């Protein structure tokens, strides 16, 4: 659909300011869910969502979260950063998966929205987190 696999691929490396993890990080601004991209060869620590799963993890992953899907599609839409301004961003290191939350914060209420980074969708991962490999060799090792 290219807004979570191609545009995410066309997202420059920018380590989002997490709180616990030092792994690779960048989040893509979409209208179809926030998109992480961490390419490190053979243990995917990736966080990718669509409108449906962000809706679900809004309605059930937090004790108090009445924010609809449109709320988080706007929060990401009203987000310009693969980084953190401090939408408060924080990391709770529970696994090697990069816990990358985009809080229910829009310059105002820090409404509760926490993460347990799942193993993201492999369709948008293996397609364009291995492109780093051959693209990187074929470009870098020749132009340098």
């Amino acid at each position: 659909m290219e807004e979570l696999e191609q545009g995410l691929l066309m997202q420059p490396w920018a380590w989002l300011q997490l709180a616990e993890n030092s792994l690779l990080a960048k989040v893509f601004i979409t209208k179809q869910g926030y998109a992480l991209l961490v390419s490190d060869l053979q243990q995917v620590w990736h966080e990718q969502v669509d409108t449906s799963v962000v809706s679900q993890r809004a309605k059930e992953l937090n004790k108090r979260l009445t924010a609809p899907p449109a709320a988080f599609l706007c929060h990401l839409d009203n987000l310009l950063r693969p980084l953190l301004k401090d939408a408060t961003f924080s990391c709770d290191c529970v696994a090697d998966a990069l816990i990358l939350r985009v809080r229910s914060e829009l310059s105002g209420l820090p409404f509760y929205w926490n993460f347990h980074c799942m193993l993201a969708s492999p369709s948008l991962v293996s397609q364009h987190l291995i492109r780093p490999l051959m693209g990187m060799s074929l470009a870098l090792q020749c132009q340098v």
């Binding site: 108090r64 979260l65 009445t66 924010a67 709320a71 929060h75 829009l106 105002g108 820090p110």
Partner: protein, 96 residues
């Protein structure tokens, strides 16, 4: 006190800025810069103070109130106290 405590617990923020919500919805502290539902509904006799920031839905208020047993008890008190305040403020104006 029970209503205040339960609202603060429910809204994912325990009086940290929920007191701000109360004083901006009830005491008119929230300006019309951002629209919310900061009013009292007589339908169920409850005051809603849902801070739907930037039209992004955050269900906050919609919590119960009480209805006066006799509107006279407060309307007459208001119609007297208002004139009393006007008189006292004019008196202190002359003093100042």
């Amino acid at each position: 006190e029970s209503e205040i405590s339960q609202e603060a617990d429910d809204m994912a923020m325990e009086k940290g800025k929920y007191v701000g919500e109360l004083r901006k919805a009830l005491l008119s502290g929230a300006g019309p810069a951002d629209v919310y539902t900061f009013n009292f509904s007589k339908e169920s006799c409850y005051f809603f103070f849902e801070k739907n920031l930037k039209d992004v839905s955050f269900r906050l208020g919609s919590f119960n109130l009480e209805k006066v047993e006799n509107p006279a008890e407060v309307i007459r008190e208001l119609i007297c106290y208002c004139l009393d305040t006007i008189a006292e403020n004019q008196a202190k104006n002359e003093h100042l």
